[PDB]
Structure formats: structure tokens, C-alpha cells
Amino acid sequence: AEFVPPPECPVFEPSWEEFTDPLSFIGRIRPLAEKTGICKIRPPKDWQPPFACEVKSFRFTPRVQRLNELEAMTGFEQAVREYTLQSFGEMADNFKSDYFNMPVHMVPTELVEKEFWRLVSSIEEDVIVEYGADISSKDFGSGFPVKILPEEEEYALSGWNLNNMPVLEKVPWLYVGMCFSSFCWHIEDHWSYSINYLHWGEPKTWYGVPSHAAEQLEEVMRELAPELFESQPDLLHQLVTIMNPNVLMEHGVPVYRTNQCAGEFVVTFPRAYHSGFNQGYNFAEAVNFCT
Ligand SMILES: O=C(O)c1ccnc2cc([C@H](OCCN3CCCCC3)c3ccccc3Cl)[nH]c12
Ligand SMILES: [Mn+2]
């Protein structure tokens, strides 16, 4: 009954010539990545943007996440508190190392993935984590340099800088993750693309569904969702659309997975449902774009 990992989504390692334009590159890999919903892009080895957030002033109040909140269906549990980037990392590393009884970097990604989905549906164990998930790049700056040192100028002007993506048909948002912090199944507003960059930290685990199976996923969601949420509009239902990928796979929905490591991009395609969780303390940046 252990979690069965979905097949891996495509991973592209473009050369420096192919890495010249994101929209041109995504358009060329489209015939394959469109059929998997998500794909991972590894930039060339020497493409390393320096972290450009104001780490000194970085303070945030993460949301509280109870992993088994849906299964517990059949409000003063924990208030939201303020962290700094360093104090949140100390809390995140202490939680994971105490939970697995080993150094955080020695915990296999398959074990965290297996334990996360066990905790989501567990009724005896109540695990509660925190996620810095409502942080705009206007708050303390983007993780990318934005027009800086001369060595940073190439990255401030790069097309893969998420601040330089075409967003007209917003600004990038930031995610400070810890172990077991997660985001449930959803598509973007206007069925837009989304591009996600992990600046540093432990990997972010993804699950994606191709757009041609979008209506099949919504059917399975509606059938198995709690009856009180079944009639809710999609924008509100998407706030609690947590579902084990094996359940979707058992109902014929194709699901692909990947572990997004530091310095790697993840692109979601139009109407491609996606979800995931963080393996540990990390820092991500994401923005929607249209083609
Ligand atoms: O956490 C990731 O890395 C990640 C990757 C891809 N898509 C999403 C979508 C979210 C999403 O954030 C809500 C808020 N933000 C978006 C809307 C504007 C404000 C900022 C979320 C957070 C936690 C639980 C559920 C969800 Cl849906 N997080 C994503
Ligand atoms: Mn998203």
C-alpha cells in the first residue's frame, strides 16, 4: 500500500545556443512537454544567478498547514507567527532532522514522498507544518537581480530572469518551503503557463497532469471530493483539492513527477493541473506568463 511514484516528467538540458530564449525554447519542446503537463529545464552549468533578496530585512508570517485536514472531516489549533529567513530555516531543519532522526541532507527523497502521502491520509498522526506562500517579490525584492554588481548584470537582463517574462495577454511570487509544506491540485488563472525557479535549498517535488486529461481529473475530483465541497466553484474548490496521485492514476489519469533541485526550472503548460510538496528548507520564485 506504499505510495507508487509516478513516471518521471521530461528533463531538458539545453545547450547555450538553445538557452537563448525561454519562449522560443518552450515552443520547441512543446510537442513533448504538452503531453506531460510539466517539464524540468536544467540551465547550462555556468548559469548561476546570485541570490538578490534583501536577506537582512526578510521577514514573513507563513501559513499553517495541517496535512490530514481533509481526512479529518470524517479553529484555534495554531496561530501564524513571524519568522526571518534564518529563523525559519533553523525551525525547518530542526523539524525534518527530528522527524526522520537523521541529518536533513541524508533523508532520501523517496522516503519523504512516501511519508508525506501517508501523513495526508493518516487519522492517528496529526502533522502540522508551515509554508511561506504569500510573499510578493515587491515585498523584499526578487531572488533574481533586477536593474547590482557587474557580474550580476547578465542575469538582470537574462530572458530566464522571471522578472523579464512576458506577462501581458503581475510580479513573481516567492515560496519559502519546509519539509511537507505543499500546494494542492490547481490550474492557473486564464489557463496560463507558469515558470518556477528554485533559487536554493532542498528539492521541490512536483506532480503534473497533461491538459488533455484535465476534464478527467476534474471528474475524479468531483466524484471523490467531500460532498460539502463538491458543488463549490473551481476557484474555491482548488483551495482544498488535495489528492494522492495514485488515486488519480487508478482512475486512468496520467500523472508525471519530478524532483526540482536548486538551480532548475519547472514549466507548467496551459490547463496542466499540478501539485507538489517541498522536501525541506528551500526558496522558490514563480510567475505566470502567456504566449
Ligand atoms: O508552492 C509552490 O511552489 C507552487 C508551485 C506551483 N503553483 C503553486 C500555487 C501555490 C499556491 O500559492 C497561493 C498563493 N500564491 C499564488 C496566488 C497569489 C499569491 C501567491 C498555494 C500555496 C499553498 C497551498 C496551496 C496553494 Cl494552491 N503554490 C504553488
Ligand atoms: Mn501553480
Short mmCIF file of N, CA, C and O and ligand atoms in Angstrom, two decimals, residues 175 183-184 186-188 194 196 206 268 272 274-275 286 288, ligand 2:
data_model
loop_
_atom_site.label_atom_id
_atom_site.label_comp_id
_atom_site.label_asym_id
_atom_site.label_seq_id
_atom_site.Cartn_x
_atom_site.Cartn_y
_atom_site.Cartn_z
N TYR A 175 8.21 31.57 -2.54
CA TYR A 175 7.76 30.47 -1.69
C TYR A 175 8.94 29.98 -0.85
O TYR A 175 9.91 29.46 -1.39
N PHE A 183 1.39 22.35 -1.93
CA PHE A 183 0.37 23.08 -2.68
C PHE A 183 -0.49 22.07 -3.42
O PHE A 183 0.04 21.16 -4.08
N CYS A 184 -1.81 22.22 -3.32
CA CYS A 184 -2.73 21.22 -3.83
C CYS A 184 -2.96 21.38 -5.33
O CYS A 184 -2.41 22.28 -5.98
N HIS A 186 -4.26 22.31 -8.90
CA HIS A 186 -4.84 23.53 -9.44
C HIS A 186 -4.30 23.76 -10.84
O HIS A 186 -3.27 23.20 -11.23
N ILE A 187 -5.02 24.59 -11.59
CA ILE A 187 -4.52 25.19 -12.81
C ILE A 187 -4.44 26.70 -12.59
O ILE A 187 -4.98 27.23 -11.63
N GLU A 188 -3.76 27.38 -13.51
CA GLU A 188 -3.59 28.82 -13.38
C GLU A 188 -4.81 29.56 -13.90
O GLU A 188 -5.60 29.04 -14.69
N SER A 194 3.08 28.72 -16.44
CA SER A 194 3.79 29.16 -15.25
C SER A 194 5.21 28.62 -15.31
O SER A 194 5.43 27.49 -15.75
N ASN A 196 8.76 28.23 -12.88
CA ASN A 196 9.14 28.16 -11.47
C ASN A 196 10.63 27.90 -11.36
O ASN A 196 11.15 26.98 -12.00
N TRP A 206 7.27 17.66 -7.59
CA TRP A 206 6.15 18.09 -8.42
C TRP A 206 5.34 16.89 -8.90
O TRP A 206 5.86 15.78 -9.05
N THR A 268 4.97 24.69 -16.23
CA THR A 268 3.66 24.08 -16.36
C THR A 268 2.95 24.67 -17.57
O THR A 268 3.01 25.88 -17.81
N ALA A 272 -2.65 22.56 -17.39
CA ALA A 272 -1.99 21.38 -16.86
C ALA A 272 -2.08 21.42 -15.34
O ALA A 272 -1.41 22.23 -14.69
N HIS A 274 -1.39 20.73 -11.58
CA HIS A 274 -0.14 20.39 -10.92
C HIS A 274 -0.28 20.57 -9.42
O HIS A 274 -1.13 21.33 -8.93
N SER A 275 0.56 19.85 -8.70
CA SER A 275 0.59 19.87 -7.24
C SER A 275 1.97 19.42 -6.79
O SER A 275 2.76 18.91 -7.59
N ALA A 286 8.20 32.16 -8.71
CA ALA A 286 7.28 31.70 -9.74
C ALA A 286 6.50 32.88 -10.31
O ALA A 286 6.23 33.85 -9.61
N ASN A 288 3.39 33.66 -13.69
CA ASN A 288 2.60 33.22 -14.82
C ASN A 288 2.97 34.02 -16.07
O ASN A 288 3.32 35.20 -15.99
MN MN B 2 0.62 26.87 -9.97
#
